[PDB]
Design a protein around this ligand. Structure first.
Ligand code: HEM
Ligand code: HEM
Lengths: 145, 145
């Protein structure tokens, strides 16, 4: 239940999400591409889903990948801004869930983003505490897939 | 090209876009839904394109419409944040252009959003000068359609 999952975002979890987002969200292009390249490097079996982006190994040089990556960061910005109201968080999460359901992305595969998030956070000195907080947010999307 | 349309956005235009967005972008749920409902009221012929959202006459109560509207405002947030780097603005604009091209939305049809934007801007007392500035930003997207 996406609603029960949203209920797991306690005061402490929301605080850690906001605090870390303040840093990671400051460079959407840089960290956005970092997230995607890490996903492709650690889970090569997911590259096939991104055929529209062309050669993803080009990273920042790939205009389609850069556009996609920046936009992805605004989806996270959206989630963070909706933390105050569970009803609004759920409706935006379901909107993005549909985008992935159409691309045939399951809850299990969506969860493969946790590894990359932990790595990007770690490179900014945010440890497991923050990685686990973000895993709870990702879990809300997984509940809608 | 799209680059040309973006590179032509002057300092004065960017100033008006940012100043007005500070206001209309401050209430994404409220102004986002207002934009969509106004589009449906003045351009009823577009209602059919949004069948995935269900009964759009339900307004704010429609969770699918609310989720869509909030997300639309983040696409605008994206554009506004990329104003000073045409290269980044272009790649994000082309990304969203693809979303509409797949939905069979022509450049002329995309331009129908100018009416709703002008009305929402006016509701906050931003006049024709601001409506003209936004029309120039919409024109960047039209260059990709
Ligand atoms: C933090 C997690 C993630 C977020 C917030 C996110 C966000 C997004 C956004 C905003 C889009 C654009 C939707 C559109 O306009 O069609 C997108 C597209 C896509 N996402 Fe994700 N995504 C995430 C994780 C993943 C993962 C882990 C996979 C795959 C294992 C995945 C697969 C896809 C695919 C295949 C597309 C379509 C790309 C294209 O053809 O343009 N996403 N995602
Ligand atoms: C300020 C201008 C506009 C912006 C920034 C914008 C933004 C968006 C965004 C972000 C999406 C979601 C993309 C996706 O996840 O697939 C979307 C979907 C869509 N847009 Fe727009 N849009 C604008 C104007 C228009 C206009 C004027 C029309 C119609 C004449 C239109 C028709 C559509 C349609 C049919 C969809 C698909 C909705 C669905 O089935 O989920 N858009 N738009």
């Amino acid at each position: 239940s996406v609603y029960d999952a949203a209920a797991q975002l306690t005061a402490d979890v929301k605080k850690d999400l906001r605090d870390s987002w303040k840093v990671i969200g400051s460079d959407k292009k840089g960290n956005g591409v970092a997230l995607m390249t890490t996903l492709f490097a650690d889970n090569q079996e997911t590259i096939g889903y991104f055929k529209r982006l062309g050669d993803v190994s080009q990273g920042m040089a790939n205009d389609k990948l850069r556009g996609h990556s920046i936009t992805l960061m605004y989806a996270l910005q959206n989630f963070i801004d909706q933390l105050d109201n569970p009803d609004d968080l759920v409706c935006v999460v379901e909107k993005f869930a549909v985008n992935h359901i159409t691309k045939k992305i399951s809850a299990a595969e969506f969860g493969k983003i946790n590894g990359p998030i932990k790595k990007v956070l770690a490179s900014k000195n945010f440890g497991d505490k923050y990685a686990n907080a973000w895993a709870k947010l990702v879990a809300v999307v997984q509940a809608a897939l």
